[PDB]
PDB file of C-alpha atoms in Angstrom:
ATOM      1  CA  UNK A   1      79.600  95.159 119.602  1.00 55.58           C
ATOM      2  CA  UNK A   2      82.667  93.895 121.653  1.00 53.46           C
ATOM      3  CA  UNK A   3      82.238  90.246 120.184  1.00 55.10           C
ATOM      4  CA  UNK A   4      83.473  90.082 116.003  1.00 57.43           C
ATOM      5  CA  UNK A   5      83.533  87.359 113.525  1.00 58.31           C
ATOM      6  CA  UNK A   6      86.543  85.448 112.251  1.00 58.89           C
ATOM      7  CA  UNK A   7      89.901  85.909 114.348  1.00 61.86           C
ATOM      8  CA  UNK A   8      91.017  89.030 115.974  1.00 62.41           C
ATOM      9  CA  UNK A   9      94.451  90.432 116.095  1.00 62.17           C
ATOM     10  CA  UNK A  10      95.753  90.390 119.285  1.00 62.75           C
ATOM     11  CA  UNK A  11      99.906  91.479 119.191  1.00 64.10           C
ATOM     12  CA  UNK A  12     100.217  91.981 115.498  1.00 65.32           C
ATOM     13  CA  UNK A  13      98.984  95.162 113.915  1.00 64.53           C
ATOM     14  CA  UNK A  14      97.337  94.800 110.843  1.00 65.37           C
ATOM     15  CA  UNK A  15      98.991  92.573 108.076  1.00 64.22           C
ATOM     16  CA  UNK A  16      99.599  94.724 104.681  1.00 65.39           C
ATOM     17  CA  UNK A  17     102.846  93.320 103.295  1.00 66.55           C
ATOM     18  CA  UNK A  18     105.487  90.580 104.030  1.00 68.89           C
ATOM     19  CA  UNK A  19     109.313  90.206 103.565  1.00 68.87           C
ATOM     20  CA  UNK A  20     110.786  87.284 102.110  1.00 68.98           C
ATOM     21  CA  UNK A  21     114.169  85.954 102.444  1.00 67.87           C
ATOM     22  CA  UNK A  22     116.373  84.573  99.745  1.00 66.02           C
ATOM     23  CA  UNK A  23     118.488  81.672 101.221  1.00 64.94           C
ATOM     24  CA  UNK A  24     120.529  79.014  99.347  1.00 66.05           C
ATOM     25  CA  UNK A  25     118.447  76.166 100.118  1.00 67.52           C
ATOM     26  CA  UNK A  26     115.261  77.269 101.142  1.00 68.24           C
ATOM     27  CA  UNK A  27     113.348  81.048 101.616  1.00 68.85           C
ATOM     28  CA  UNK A  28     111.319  82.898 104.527  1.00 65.59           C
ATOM     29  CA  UNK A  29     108.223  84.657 104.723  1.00 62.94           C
ATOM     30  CA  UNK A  30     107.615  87.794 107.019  1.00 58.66           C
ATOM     31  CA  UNK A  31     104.208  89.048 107.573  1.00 57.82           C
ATOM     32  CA  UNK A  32     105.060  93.399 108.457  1.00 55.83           C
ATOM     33  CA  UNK A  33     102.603  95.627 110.124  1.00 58.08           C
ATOM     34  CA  UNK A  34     101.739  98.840 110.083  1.00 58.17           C
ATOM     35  CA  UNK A  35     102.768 100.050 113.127  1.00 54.90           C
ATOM     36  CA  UNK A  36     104.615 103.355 111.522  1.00 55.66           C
ATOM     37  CA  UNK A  37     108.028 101.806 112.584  1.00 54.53           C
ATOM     38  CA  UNK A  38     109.581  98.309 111.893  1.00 52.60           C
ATOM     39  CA  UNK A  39     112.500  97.133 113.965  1.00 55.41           C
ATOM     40  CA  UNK A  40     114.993  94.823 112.418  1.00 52.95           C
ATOM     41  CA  UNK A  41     117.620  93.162 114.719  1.00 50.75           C
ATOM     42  CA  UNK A  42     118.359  89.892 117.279  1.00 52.52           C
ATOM     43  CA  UNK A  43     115.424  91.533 119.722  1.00 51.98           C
ATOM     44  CA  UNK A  44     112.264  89.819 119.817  1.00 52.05           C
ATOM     45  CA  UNK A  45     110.666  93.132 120.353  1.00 51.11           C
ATOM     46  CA  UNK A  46     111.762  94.132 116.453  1.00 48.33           C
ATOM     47  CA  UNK A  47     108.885  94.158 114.204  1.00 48.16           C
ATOM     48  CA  UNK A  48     111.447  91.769 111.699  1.00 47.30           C
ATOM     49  CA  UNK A  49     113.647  89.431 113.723  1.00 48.76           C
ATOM     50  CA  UNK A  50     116.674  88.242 111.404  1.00 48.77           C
ATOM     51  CA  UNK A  51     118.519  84.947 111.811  1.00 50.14           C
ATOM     52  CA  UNK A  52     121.827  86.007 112.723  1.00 52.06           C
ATOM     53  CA  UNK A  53     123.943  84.934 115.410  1.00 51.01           C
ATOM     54  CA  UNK A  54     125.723  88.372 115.627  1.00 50.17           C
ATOM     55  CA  UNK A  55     123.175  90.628 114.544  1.00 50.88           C
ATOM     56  CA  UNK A  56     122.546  94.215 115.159  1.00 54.35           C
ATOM     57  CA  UNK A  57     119.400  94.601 117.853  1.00 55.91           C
ATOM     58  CA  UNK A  58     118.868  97.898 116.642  1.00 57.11           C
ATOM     59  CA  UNK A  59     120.505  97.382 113.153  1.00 59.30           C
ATOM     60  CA  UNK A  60     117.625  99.294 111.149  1.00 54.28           C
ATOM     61  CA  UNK A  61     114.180 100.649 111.380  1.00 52.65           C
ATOM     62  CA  UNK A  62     111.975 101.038 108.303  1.00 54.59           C
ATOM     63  CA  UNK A  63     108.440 103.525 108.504  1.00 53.60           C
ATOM     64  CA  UNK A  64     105.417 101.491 106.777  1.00 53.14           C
ATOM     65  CA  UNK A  65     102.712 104.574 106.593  1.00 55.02           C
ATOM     66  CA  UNK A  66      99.587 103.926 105.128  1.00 55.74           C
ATOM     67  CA  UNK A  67      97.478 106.684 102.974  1.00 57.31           C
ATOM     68  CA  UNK A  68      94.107 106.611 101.023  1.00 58.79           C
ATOM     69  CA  UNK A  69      94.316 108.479  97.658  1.00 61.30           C
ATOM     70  CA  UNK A  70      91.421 109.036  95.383  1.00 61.83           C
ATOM     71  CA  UNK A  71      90.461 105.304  96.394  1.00 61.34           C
ATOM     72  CA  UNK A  72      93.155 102.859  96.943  1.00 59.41           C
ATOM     73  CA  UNK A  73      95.492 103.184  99.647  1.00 58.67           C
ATOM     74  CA  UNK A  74      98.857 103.218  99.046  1.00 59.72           C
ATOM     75  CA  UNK A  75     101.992 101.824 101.436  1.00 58.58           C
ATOM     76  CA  UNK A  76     105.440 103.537 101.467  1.00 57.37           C
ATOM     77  CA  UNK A  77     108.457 102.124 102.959  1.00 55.65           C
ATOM     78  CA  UNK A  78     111.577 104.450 104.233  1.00 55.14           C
ATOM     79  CA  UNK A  79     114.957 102.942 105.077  1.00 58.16           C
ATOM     80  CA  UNK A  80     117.171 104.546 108.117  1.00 56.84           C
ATOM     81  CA  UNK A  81     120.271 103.671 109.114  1.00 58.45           C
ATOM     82  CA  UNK A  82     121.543 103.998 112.841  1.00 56.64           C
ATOM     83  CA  UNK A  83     123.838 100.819 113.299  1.00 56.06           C
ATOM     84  CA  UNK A  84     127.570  99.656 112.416  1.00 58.22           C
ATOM     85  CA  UNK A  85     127.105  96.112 111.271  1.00 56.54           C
ATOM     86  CA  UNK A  86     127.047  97.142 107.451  1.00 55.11           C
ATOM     87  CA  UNK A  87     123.609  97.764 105.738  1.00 56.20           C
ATOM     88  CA  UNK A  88     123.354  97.435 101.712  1.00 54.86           C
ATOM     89  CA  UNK A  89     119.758  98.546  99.929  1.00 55.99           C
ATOM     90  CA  UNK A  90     118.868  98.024  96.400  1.00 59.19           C
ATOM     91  CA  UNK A  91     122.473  96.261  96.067  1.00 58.55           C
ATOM     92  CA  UNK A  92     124.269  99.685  97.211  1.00 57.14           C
ATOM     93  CA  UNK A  93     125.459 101.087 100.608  1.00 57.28           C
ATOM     94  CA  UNK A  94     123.188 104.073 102.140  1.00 61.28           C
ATOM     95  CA  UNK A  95     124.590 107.519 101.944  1.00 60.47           C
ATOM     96  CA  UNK A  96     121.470 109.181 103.174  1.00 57.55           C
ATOM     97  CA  UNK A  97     118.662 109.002 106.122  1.00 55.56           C
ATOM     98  CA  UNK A  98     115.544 109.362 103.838  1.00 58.49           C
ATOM     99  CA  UNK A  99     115.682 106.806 101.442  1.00 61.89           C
ATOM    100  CA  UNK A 100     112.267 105.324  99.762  1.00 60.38           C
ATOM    101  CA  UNK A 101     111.615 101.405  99.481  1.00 59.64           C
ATOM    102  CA  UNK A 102     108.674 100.674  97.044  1.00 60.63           C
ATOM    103  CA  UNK A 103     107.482  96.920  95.819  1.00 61.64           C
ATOM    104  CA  UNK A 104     110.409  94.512  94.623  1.00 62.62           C
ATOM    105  CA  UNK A 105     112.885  96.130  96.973  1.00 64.43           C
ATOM    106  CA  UNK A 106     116.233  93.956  97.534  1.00 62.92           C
ATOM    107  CA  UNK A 107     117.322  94.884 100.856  1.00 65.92           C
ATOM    108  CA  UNK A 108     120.998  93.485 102.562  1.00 65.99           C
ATOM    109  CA  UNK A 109     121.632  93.704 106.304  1.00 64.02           C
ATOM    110  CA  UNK A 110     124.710  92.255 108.045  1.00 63.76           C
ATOM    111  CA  UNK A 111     126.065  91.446 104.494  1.00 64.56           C
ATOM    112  CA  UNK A 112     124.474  87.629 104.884  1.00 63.51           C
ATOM    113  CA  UNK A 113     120.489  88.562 105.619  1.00 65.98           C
ATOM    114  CA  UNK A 114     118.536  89.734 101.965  1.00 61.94           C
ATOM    115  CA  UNK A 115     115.293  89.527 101.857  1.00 62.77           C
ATOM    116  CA  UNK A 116     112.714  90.925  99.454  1.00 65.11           C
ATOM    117  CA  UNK A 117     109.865  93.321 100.204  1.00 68.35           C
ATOM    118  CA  UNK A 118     106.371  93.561  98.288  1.00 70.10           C
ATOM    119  CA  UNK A 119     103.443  94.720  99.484  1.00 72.73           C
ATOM    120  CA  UNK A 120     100.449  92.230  99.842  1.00 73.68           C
ATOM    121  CA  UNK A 121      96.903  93.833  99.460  1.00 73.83           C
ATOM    122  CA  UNK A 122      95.665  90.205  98.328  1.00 75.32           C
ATOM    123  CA  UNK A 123      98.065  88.467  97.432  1.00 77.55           C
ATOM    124  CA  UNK A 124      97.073  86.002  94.739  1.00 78.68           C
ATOM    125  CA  UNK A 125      97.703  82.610  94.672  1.00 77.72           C
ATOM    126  CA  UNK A 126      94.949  79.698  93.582  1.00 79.96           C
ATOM    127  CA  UNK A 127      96.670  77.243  92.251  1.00 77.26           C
ATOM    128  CA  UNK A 128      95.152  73.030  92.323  1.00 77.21           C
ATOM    129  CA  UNK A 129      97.308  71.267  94.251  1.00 76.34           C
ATOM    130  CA  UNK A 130      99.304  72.721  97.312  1.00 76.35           C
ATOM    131  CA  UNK A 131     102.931  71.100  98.931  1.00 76.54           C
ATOM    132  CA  UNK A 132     101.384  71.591 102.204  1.00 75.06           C
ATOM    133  CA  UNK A 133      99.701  69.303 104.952  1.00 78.44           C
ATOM    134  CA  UNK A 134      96.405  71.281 105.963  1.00 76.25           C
ATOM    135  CA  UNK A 135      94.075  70.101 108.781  1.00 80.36           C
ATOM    136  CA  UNK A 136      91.428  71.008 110.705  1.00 79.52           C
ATOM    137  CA  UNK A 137      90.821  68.450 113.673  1.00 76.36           C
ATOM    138  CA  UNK A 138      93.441  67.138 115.690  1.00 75.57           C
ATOM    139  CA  UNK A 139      94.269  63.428 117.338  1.00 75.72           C
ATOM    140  CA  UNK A 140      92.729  61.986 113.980  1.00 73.42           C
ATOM    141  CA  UNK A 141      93.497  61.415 110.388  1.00 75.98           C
TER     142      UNK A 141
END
């Protein structure tokens, strides 16, 4: 069948984790695909657009490769560096090209941008009452 229930993705991948920000004074939420390579930079065309008015297009790329084992897939991350603007993971600088990013990563770029990465497989959060305006129909209410 061509036709599916529910909503399709259309320019996004497949969501399997998210990337938020920490920012004095509020915090961002990034859905990330897995589209084998993330782009991080000032291009729209990066997987992970930062909020920088000087920051690197091509600043980093990060692999998200996805793998069943025994029953549950697992998601691994791998941070590369190929920029000059100054890149800091797990609170220290890169040496090497092969580095491994798992859940409850800290990860620096520019030296102003840190955001934290976790992988979301369901992501749990029922709670009663929600700071958030939610509505279905429009022009009413």
């Amino acid at each position: 069948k061509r036709q599916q229930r529910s909503n399709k993705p259309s320019s996004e991948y497949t969501c399997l984790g998210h990337l938020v920000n920490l920012i004095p004074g509020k915090e961002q939420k990034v859905e990330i695909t897995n589209r084998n390579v993330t782009t991080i930079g000032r291009s729209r065309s990066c997987d992970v657009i930062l909020s920088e008015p000087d920051i690197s297009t091509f600043h980093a790329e990060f692999h998200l490769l996805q793998m069943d084992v025994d029953n549950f897939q697992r998601n691994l991350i791998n941070v590369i560096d190929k920029s000059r603007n100054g890149t800091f993971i797990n609170g220290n600088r890169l040496v090497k090209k092969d580095y491994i990013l798992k859940n409850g990563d800290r990860i620096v770029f520019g030296k102003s941008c840190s955001f934290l990465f976790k992988y979301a497989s369901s992501s749990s959060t029922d709670i009663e009452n929600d700071d958030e305006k939610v509505s279905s129909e429009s022009r009413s209410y």
